[PDB]
Amino acid sequence: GVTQINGVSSRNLQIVLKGDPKVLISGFVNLRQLDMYGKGTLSLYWIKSDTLTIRAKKAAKIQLAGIVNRLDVELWDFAQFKGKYLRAQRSFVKTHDKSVAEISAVNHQSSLATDASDIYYYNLSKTRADFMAFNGSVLDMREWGQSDLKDFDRYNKQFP
Amino acid sequence: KFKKPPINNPSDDATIKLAEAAVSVSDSMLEMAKVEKVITPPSKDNTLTIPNAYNLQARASVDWSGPIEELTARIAKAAHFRFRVLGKSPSVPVLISISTKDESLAEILRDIDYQAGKKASIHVYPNSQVVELRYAKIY
Amino acid sequence: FKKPPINNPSDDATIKLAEAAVSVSDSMLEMAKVEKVITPPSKDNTLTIPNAYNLQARASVDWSGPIEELTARIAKAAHFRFRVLGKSPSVPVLISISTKDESLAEILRDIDYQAGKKASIHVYPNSQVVELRYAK
Amino acid sequence: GCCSKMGGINYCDSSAGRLVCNNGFYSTCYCTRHAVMDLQFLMGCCLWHGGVYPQLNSSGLVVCNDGYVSEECSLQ
Amino acid sequence: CFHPPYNNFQPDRRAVKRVGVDTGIGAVAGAIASGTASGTLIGAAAGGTVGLVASIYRDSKRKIIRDLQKQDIQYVEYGDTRTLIIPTDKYFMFSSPRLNEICYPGLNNVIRLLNFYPQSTIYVAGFTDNVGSRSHKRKLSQAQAETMMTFLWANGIAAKRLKAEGYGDKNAISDNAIIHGSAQNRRIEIQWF
Amino acid sequence: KLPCRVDGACDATIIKMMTDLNKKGIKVASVGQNYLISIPASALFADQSPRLNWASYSLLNEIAAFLKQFRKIAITVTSYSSKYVSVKRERALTLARSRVVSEYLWSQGVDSRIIFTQGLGSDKPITSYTLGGDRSPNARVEITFRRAV
Amino acid sequence: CDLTKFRWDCDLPVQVKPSPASSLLVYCGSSYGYITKQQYDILARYQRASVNMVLDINGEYIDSPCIGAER
Amino acid sequence: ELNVNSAEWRAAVAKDENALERFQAKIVITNKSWQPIIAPVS
């Protein structure tokens, strides 16, 4: 089913998807928990959250834009989390077999890619720590041409 | 048994005296940097004169203790930028010593320019792919 | 099997020495950052490449003497006319260019920069003329 | 020898300061004193002070060329 | 059986010569051993087989490369771009485009190796050291590269497959400020796919 | 009274380690003073990820010893790989791989003033056989330098 | 151009006069020509790849190195 | 004798010939050519 909501203001919101819908939401949302067990698709345009917890299982597409103080993503298989533009002060991102996540952490970033998984950090957090288990990858995916591309510091330099 | 975690290798009193002197120098230098920064804070960043671009984001780990021109020329060649020199190189060489580890060529050029200071200045024109070192008009 | 760095500080005092060196290098860099005066590209008083086709020709120059002679010779090689606006000083403005492969435009840039505020060079490509403007 | 497991010493190339072996490869062995050596430990008294001032000693003092007295070399 | 100067650019016959000599010696040995027509035939067959295996060895690409390295020619294979580096100091008359025909074994080996790749595109490039004028080095390298290209084309390579270009002291594989490096910089490079 | 050779380097050793690396599969070529070590990315990293296997550190140790056998001013570590996802993806992956290999080689202190690092992704393949991932021939790490004097 | 294949073979035409369309300098050795913005971008890509881009006129090599210059 | 009248000195500027006054005129930047084996040497 296709859902199109234009204008939402909440201090808490919970979304659980068990099928394959196409739901897009507009406004400001204090999203807290997000659960996906099917091949669903969801989008939020502006979110102002304090602690987001995303758990995606099977071929679920998620897109969120806004600010988050503490984001925790767990992708399991074929799950896409287009979390770019969602600047999380603290990021806890874990990806499992053949899943893709895009993160834009700001202050502290902690990532783990287990096997055949991908994490792409489009922002240079003040401190970063990424781990790879079998074949998982954590890449930078920055432009290299931005006139103000910040370089790694003594506290940023992690060598994969 | 009883133990405490830092069980390092043996150290020599030569290294110990050097460590104490180095810490004293570091404290004096911190005080000096703080007082001068408070006296007159910086107003302009050299990223204007050395704007980064593609192929300036290639990285390099440098350990150099010689004159500025050769290091700048090697950096430019590795960046595929034509190297140009302005001004008369002074009789007293503009020595620099850059000891970094895996940092981009734009950052290395910025470090070289800052270390040169009033003696030499590095500019980068990415439109013309030119790295230009100019020795100041002293003398 | 991975091996530790051969230069790793593993002595109780060597580690402190190394962090002290790191701190002194950092404070050196901060001093240099505060000390350095820079000229933004917008406010840079220096000749920009005239882009004139005849001036793009490569050259090879080994000159150390008056600015007027080399500027006139560069202009004549570039086929531009040459003119001087101002009064020549008593002590001549001496410059030096020792290059093996550098275009006439870049040589003019170097000549102007070495002249500094004693003289400047302007290039008119529409009416192909190199002007040496003295300063009073 | 020097050019071992190569052909052998072809000739000393004084411009570079190294031996050239019977294959095109240079050799790690120097052939003239003007080869670039990474000399970091240099023996001798009064280094960095002008060397030992050549005077017939009346005492055990070893005086450098700039007047500084090398205490590490003087007699006790 | 073989004219030393390039064999008149005619096909070379070591295979047939070696198998013929081997059959001759085998037939002679069999005739001595037996004294019978069947024994002579057996000896000739043995000579033929041993000559076949010997020529299979000696006409191999690896043996040709070993021979080219016994001569002063270097072979480099990176992926599928194969390069022969031939020193002008030995394979050209001094400071002249003239080929050094005393070194005909090396040139014949180069041609034979290039014959193993009938579809490859060959680029011949000439290089000189830093000594001389810029125009002098450019012209001399171009002349030597053209002479090598002409030799390749004469020995049986189509004119479309060949391009010859001469760089001066531009692309150096060694330091010209030292004698042996300057010597290593004097070379001809033959690249093919 | 003076050293007879550059410390810790032997010609027999250089020849032996070149032979051993070529036997293993690491191509060690030398044209003039220029040396090239081409390493298949499958012998160092995991499948299209910038994470070295623990077993590959012995190979990196041999390569570090080979680099230490020479005196030089600047090494260059370049990474190439087969196309997997996107141009930016392979460029970032190759840059990260070059960074990590360069970092390990730098830690295993080599006589190199500068160690340049870069990755062009899939810009300069050396073989038309592009089938395969990290097993493909043109997915590799190139360590090129010039012997100094 | 075709930049990956195996041999990255391609062709960039050069215009001697600084046309408004093609006004970006290329220094082929001592001989300099002008090309377009896309041509300069792909030339810079090949330069990053470290590929020789010798200037050829009528199939004849003229000058070895090509380096982008002022736009 | 060396003359100290710097006004009388005569500078000499060399030049190198480009495609000026020269150019089917198929002026082309061709990469199909010899390519170095050890390409990125710095």
Coordinates of N, CA and C in Angstrom, one line a residue, chain A residues 143-149 151-152 157 159, chain B residues 47 52-54 57 59 101-104 107:
Chain A
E143 N 33.8 13.7 -1.4 CA 33.9 14.2 -2.8 C 35.3 14.4 -3.3
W144 N 36.3 14.6 -2.4 CA 37.7 14.9 -2.7 C 37.9 16.2 -3.4
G145 N 36.8 16.9 -3.7 CA 36.9 18.2 -4.5 C 36.3 19.3 -3.8
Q146 N 35.6 19.1 -2.6 CA 35.0 20.2 -1.8 C 36.2 21.1 -1.4
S147 N 35.9 22.4 -1.5 CA 36.9 23.4 -1.2 C 37.3 23.4 0.3
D148 N 36.5 22.7 1.1 CA 36.8 22.7 2.6 C 36.8 21.3 3.1
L149 N 37.5 20.4 2.4 CA 37.5 19.0 2.9 C 38.4 18.9 4.0
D151 N 40.7 17.2 6.7 CA 41.6 16.1 6.7 C 41.5 15.4 8.1
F152 N 42.0 14.1 8.1 CA 42.0 13.4 9.4 C 43.0 14.0 10.4
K157 N 42.6 9.4 12.7 CA 43.3 8.5 11.7 C 43.1 7.1 12.1
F159 N 43.2 3.3 10.4 CA 43.6 2.6 9.1 C 42.9 1.3 9.1
Chain B
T47 N 44.2 28.1 3.7 CA 43.5 27.4 2.7 C 43.0 28.2 1.5
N52 N 42.3 23.3 -1.9 CA 42.4 21.9 -2.3 C 41.5 21.6 -3.4
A53 N 41.9 20.5 -4.1 CA 41.1 20.1 -5.3 C 41.4 18.6 -5.5
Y54 N 40.8 18.0 -6.5 CA 41.1 16.6 -6.8 C 42.5 16.5 -7.2
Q57 N 44.2 15.5 -3.1 CA 43.8 14.7 -2.0 C 44.5 13.3 -2.0
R59 N 47.5 11.2 -0.8 CA 48.1 11.3 0.5 C 49.6 10.8 0.5
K101 N 52.6 11.7 8.6 CA 52.2 10.3 8.4 C 50.8 10.2 7.8
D102 N 50.8 9.9 6.5 CA 49.5 9.6 5.8 C 48.6 10.8 5.9
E103 N 48.9 11.9 5.3 CA 48.1 13.1 5.2 C 48.1 13.7 3.8
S104 N 47.0 14.3 3.4 CA 46.8 14.7 2.0 C 47.8 15.7 1.6
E107 N 47.2 19.2 2.7 CA 47.6 19.4 4.1 C 49.1 19.6 4.2

